[PDB]
């Protein structure tokens, strides 16, 4: 048996948290980076039941974006695979967050994702160095409309944006400039979103359209693929 992909484990934990219903994730990776994501979810008010072997986690979904009141620091050690999807998702609801981690987290570049979120109206501030964590993020919701993303962008940034786009105020259209790289990785993300009940119209990787009014819905069990 092969363990779950770290990035798939954290992305599926975040969708399970946003989704209606409880999702039993299986083959979850037993890793501290998954624990940093669980800890963020706990601080954000999400309940879950984690099995003794740490590879099974039932996440009780909020059925909508996070809404916290007290300003919160979310310290994520060196978990890039938790920082990136959260930088986007934290813009969707209500709250005031500092997204940060250990000194090495501050060396993880994040500017291309911040730029995409800001095209959709996000309120994000760099607290130390431009283009890097720590970030101060305000929950504002994301605006409907067209955003333009470069085809050479690292897939993890495009993925983080796509995962949050269904919870924007209306239809989101992502235009890609040039030839999109890492198409198979984008495919994995689109597949996970589909399992959580969301449709993304893919125009041969030149444009992605996320119709308005969708919600993530628990598929019951989500099996985390290897890699
Ligand atoms: Cl990483
Ligand atoms: Cl990532
Ligand atoms: Cl990715």
Q: Give the pairing of strands 22-26 and 221-223.
A: parallel
Going by C-beta distance under 8 Å and a sequence separation of 6 or more, which residues neighbour residue 199?
A: 210, 211, 214
Ligand 3 (ion): residues with CB under 5 Å are: 155-156, 159, 185
CA of 85 to the centre of ligand 1 (A): 11
Of 132, 84, 94, give the one whose Cα is nearest residue 111. Answer: 132
Q: Give 65: exposed, middle or buried? Use CB within 10 Å, 0-12, 13-18, 19+.
A: buried
Q: Give the pairing of strands 145-150 and 172-177.
A: parallel
Token digits of residue 192 = 């996970």
Strand order in the sheet with 207-210: 145-150, 172-177, 207-210, 201-202
Q: What are phi and psi of 45, to 5 degrees?
A: 90, 20
CA of 80 to the centre of ligand 3 (A): 12
Region 1-227: CATH code:
3.65.10.10
Q: Which residues are annotated as a binding site for phosphoenolpyruvate?
A: 6, 80, 108, 156
- Cβ atoms of residues 138 and 95 within 8 Å: yes
The Cα–Cα gap between 178 and 7 comes to: 26
Of 174, 161, 76, give the one whose Cα is nearest residue 124. Answer: 161
The Cα–Cα gap between 119 and 39 comes to: 29
- Cβ atoms of residues 208 and 162 within 8 Å: yes
Q: Give 77: exposed, middle or buried? Use CB within 10 Å, 0-12, 13-18, 19+.
A: middle
CB atoms within 10 A of CB 155: 19
Token digits of residue 75 = 């310290």
Sign of CA dihedral 189, 191, 193, 196: negative
Method in brief? X-ray
CA of 84 to the centre of ligand 1 (A): 9
Of 32, 22, 6, 7, give the one whose Cα is nearest residue 163. Answer: 7
Helices (H) and strands (E) in the chain, counts: 6, 12
Query: Resolution, in Å, please?
Result: 1.9
Q: Which ligand is nearest to the CA of 79?
A: 1
The Cα–Cα gap between 55 and 103 comes to: 28
Under the phi-then-psi rule, with left for phi > 0, alpha for psi from -120 to 50, and beta for the rest, what region is 70?
Answer: beta
CA dist 141 to 16, 44, 56, 150, 154, Å?
A: 19, 16, 31, 23, 24
Q: Which ligand is nearest to the CA of 83?
A: 2
- Cβ atoms of residues 143 and 123 within 8 Å: no
Q: Is the peptide bond before 91 cis (omega within 30 degrees of 0)?
A: no
Q: Where are the alpha helices (DSSP H) in the chain?
A: 6-18, 32-43, 80-89, 111-119, 155-164, 183-195
For residue 70, the surrounding DSSP H or E stretch is: none
Q: Which ligand is nearest to the CA of 85?
A: 2
Token digits of residue 112 = 């291309």
Q: Which ligand is nearest to the CA of 10?
A: 2
Q: What are phi and psi of 51, to 5 degrees?
A: -70, 160
């Amino acid at each position: 048996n092969l363990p779950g992909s770290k990035s798939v484990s954290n992305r599926a934990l975040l969708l399970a948290a946003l989704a209606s219903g409880t999702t039993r994730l299986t083959n979850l990776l037993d890793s501290d980076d998954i624990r940093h994501m669980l800890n963020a979810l706990t601080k954000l008010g999400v309940n879950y039941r984690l099995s003794a072997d740490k590879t099974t986690c039932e996440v009780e979904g909020l059925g909508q974006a996070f809404h916290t009141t007290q300003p919160l620091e979310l310290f994520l050690g060196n978990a890039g695979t938790a920082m990136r999807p959260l930088a986007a998702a934290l813009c969707l609801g209500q709250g005031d967050y500092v997204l940060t981690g250990e000194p090495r987290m501050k060396e993880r570049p994040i500017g291309h994702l911040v730029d995409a979120l800001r095209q959709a109206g996000a309120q994000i501030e760099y607290l130390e160095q431009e283009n890097f964590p720590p970030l101060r993020i305000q929950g504002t919701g994301l605006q409907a409309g067209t955003v333009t993303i470069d085809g050479s962008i690292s897939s993890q940034f495009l993925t983080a944006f796509l995962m949050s786009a269904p919870l924007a105020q209306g239809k989101v259209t992502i235009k890609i400039v040039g030839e999109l790289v890492s198409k198979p990785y984008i495919d994995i993300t689109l597949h996970i979103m589909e399992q959580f009940g969301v449709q993304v119209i893919n125009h041969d990787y030149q444009e992605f359209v996320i119709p308005a009014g969708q919600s993530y819905v628990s598929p019951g069990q989500f099996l985390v693929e290897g890699d």
